[PDB]
């Protein structure tokens, strides 16, 4: 019986408490759904997934998998690389 | 130990695009990389090639 | 990478239903790749002056 | 049981060709492995007679199995547990048992739920599987040509 509330609790702070731009759950978990389908049509097919092919296994419009993919982008640091090496932070 | 994976012949296919058009389209000059892979039970016994 | 995720793999996954199709992963390794030939201190940039 | 030649049917990859009885000897024990391959997954695979009634490789469904599984998939009363998580390990574990009464009674089962609920894409992907899984095995059970079996599949399930 504890293993479920342990899941779901962990998978909550998860969802709710990783991300610097915080996205609530439900578009977490439709991240997460087209990301696991993605990749698993990369490890079978083999070719590539479109974004429209990716929203017709999605049962969405290709639209809405183009939101998605823009909504998962995370932020960089600005203390990183210059261009290639961390020579100078990018925020300069 | 009841169960094992292995590997054997790396093998390639021909290059999916030529130089140039790899250098215009900004995509890699790659090829595929294809593997015989074998996986074998112990217990009762199968090979998964 | 690949190795550690097919031998977590291996036990969780139930026997005399798999085959190396379903326990492969090669997001790691050209995952690898990719980080090697770009953004790599020795994958340099090809100087043609 | 199982001579060269046969068109053998093996679980889950349905039916399959035998090329040859291999002599592949291990310790010293010249075991009477067979070569045995199927179209799906382009893979060969070697099984010993001995134990080859252990890993269960069937026979093709002829009359009785074909309207068998008609009169399950046509079977009303049906109800599941209304948590929809032990349907789905239910269901799940019948599906990975793969016999072609329980195969038949899954789909059924999910297409007189999707025909007004609706499932998960998730859902409708373990559908696609078992429904590939079953329209092979009957495709290849009348030998009748793998989209005419899709057709006259979804004949039947209107009824």
Redesign the interface.
Same mark, same amino acid.
Request: charged share 65%.
């Given at each position: 019986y504890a293993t479920w509330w342990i899941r779901q609790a962990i998978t909550r702070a998860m969802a709710d408490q990783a991300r610097t731009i915080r996205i609530p759950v439900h578009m977490v978990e439709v991240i997460n759904?087209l990301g696991r389908?993605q990749?698993e049509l990369?490890?079978?097919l083999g070719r590539e997934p479109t974004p429209e092919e990716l929203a017709k296994?999605? @049962?969405i419009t290709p639209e809405k998998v183009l939101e998605i993919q823009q909504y998962a982008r995370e932020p960089i640091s600005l203390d990183q690389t210059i261009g @290639?090496?961390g020579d100078s932070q990018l925020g300069d | 130990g009841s169960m094992s994976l292995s590997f054997s012949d790396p093998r390639f296919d021909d290059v999916k695009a030529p130089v140039d058009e790899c250098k215009d389209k900004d995509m890699t000059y790659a090829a595929p990389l294809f593997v015989t892979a074998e996986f074998i039970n112990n217990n009762t016994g199968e090979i998964k090639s | 990478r690949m190795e550690r995720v097919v031998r977590e793999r291996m036990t969780t996954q139930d026997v005399e239903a798999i085959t190396p199709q379903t326990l492969i992963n090669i997001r790691p390794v050209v995952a690898a790749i990719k980080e090697f030939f770009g953004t790599s201190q020795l994958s340099q940039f090809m100087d043609q002056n | 049981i199982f001579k060269v030649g046969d068109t053998v049917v093996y679980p889950h990859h349905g039916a399959a060709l035998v090329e040859a009885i291999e002599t592949r000897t291990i310790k010293g024990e010249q075991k009477e492995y067979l070569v045995l391959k199927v179209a799906q997954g382009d893979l060969t695979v070697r099984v010993p007679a001995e134990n080859a009634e252990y890993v269960g490789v069937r026979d093709v469904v002829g009359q009785e199995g074909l309207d068998k599984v008609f009169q399950v998939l046509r079977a009303p009363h049906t109800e599941e547990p209304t948590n929809w998580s032990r349907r789905y390990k239910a269901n799940l574990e019948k599906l990975a048992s793969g016999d072609v009464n329980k195969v038949a009674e899954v789909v059924r089962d999910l297409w007189r739920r999707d025909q007004e609920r609706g499932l998960s894409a998730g859902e409708k992907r373990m559908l696609a599987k078992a429904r590939q899984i079953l329209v092979g095995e009957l495709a290849l059970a009348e030998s009748t040509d793998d989209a005419k079996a899709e057709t006259i599949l979804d004949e039947v399930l209107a009824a």
């Open positions: 759904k389908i990749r990369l490890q079978d296994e999605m @049962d @290639d090496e | - | - | -």
